Scaffold this active site. Sequence first.
Site, PDB file in Angstrom:
ATOM      1  N   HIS A 108     -20.016  32.310  11.480  1.00 57.80           N
ATOM      2  CA  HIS A 108     -21.393  33.662  11.035  1.00 57.80           C
ATOM      3  C   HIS A 108     -20.715  34.402   9.956  1.00 57.80           C
ATOM      4  O   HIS A 108     -19.541  34.761  10.422  1.00 57.80           O
ATOM      5  CB  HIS A 108     -22.195  33.726  11.653  1.00 57.80           C
ATOM      6  N   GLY A 109     -21.487  35.212   9.193  1.00 59.43           N
ATOM      7  CA  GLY A 109     -21.308  36.916   8.050  1.00 59.43           C
ATOM      8  C   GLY A 109     -22.859  37.610   8.300  1.00 59.43           C
ATOM      9  O   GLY A 109     -23.551  37.240   8.727  1.00 59.43           O
ATOM     10  N   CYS A 156     -21.308  32.191   7.702  1.00 58.85           N
ATOM     11  CA  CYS A 156     -22.886  31.429   7.466  1.00 58.85           C
ATOM     12  C   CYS A 156     -23.865  33.204   7.544  1.00 58.85           C
ATOM     13  O   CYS A 156     -23.315  33.760   8.391  1.00 58.85           O
ATOM     14  CB  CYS A 156     -23.182  30.486   8.108  1.00 58.85           C
TER      15      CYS A 156
END
Length: 247
Positions: A108-109, A156
């Site tokens: 994730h980001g 993401c």
Amino acid sequence: EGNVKLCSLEEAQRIWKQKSAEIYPIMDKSSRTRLALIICNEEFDSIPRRTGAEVDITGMTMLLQNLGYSVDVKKNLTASDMTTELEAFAHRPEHKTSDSTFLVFMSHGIREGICGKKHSEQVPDILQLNAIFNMLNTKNCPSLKDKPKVIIIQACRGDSPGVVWFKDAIKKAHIEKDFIAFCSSTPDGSVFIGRLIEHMQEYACSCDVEEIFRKVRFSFEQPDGRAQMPATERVTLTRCFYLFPGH
């Protein structure tokens, strides 16, 4: 799995002619020691599991091996642990006898970073993109000076760009050079990684990496799933990076 199409002796000749030798040199197959690093976060303290991760790890590992890289895989790291791993990777002796590297992040980001396994609103766990470039730059990674460093970042984000609806004795060296990043923020193997692998397999023989990334974007030009439009970023390549698969 698919198959990496090889660059014929004929194709290689064509490539060298047309680009006026403005191509990154490749080292001898039987002596070079190419490395790649995959960091993949799938299991998180406070954010959703990324269920397609193992398929994506498998595909990227096999691709990078087929392109001639020895691949390290690290899973479910904090930002601190990612930092430690990147510093160690930068210091690997193999880079001295390598012509290139790949780093692949899958997590994730947030807008300005990649999430570590402990990331939360209340207590951030973020690896800044700047940190990646800093740790692999000319000062911190002299072994990869003048060599292409390809950074694939799948991070993401809930706020991934979407869609609009319509009707109808001493010498100086540059601190940061010879990087290219290819960045996907699209959340839910994953569509982005699958498409990237397909394009690398089909076009590594004939196209430099910058053009392969363009072709990936072209393949995504019409939205259908959650929109995919991965940007090429932070490009300081001075030459064309051809992978010359088979060489």
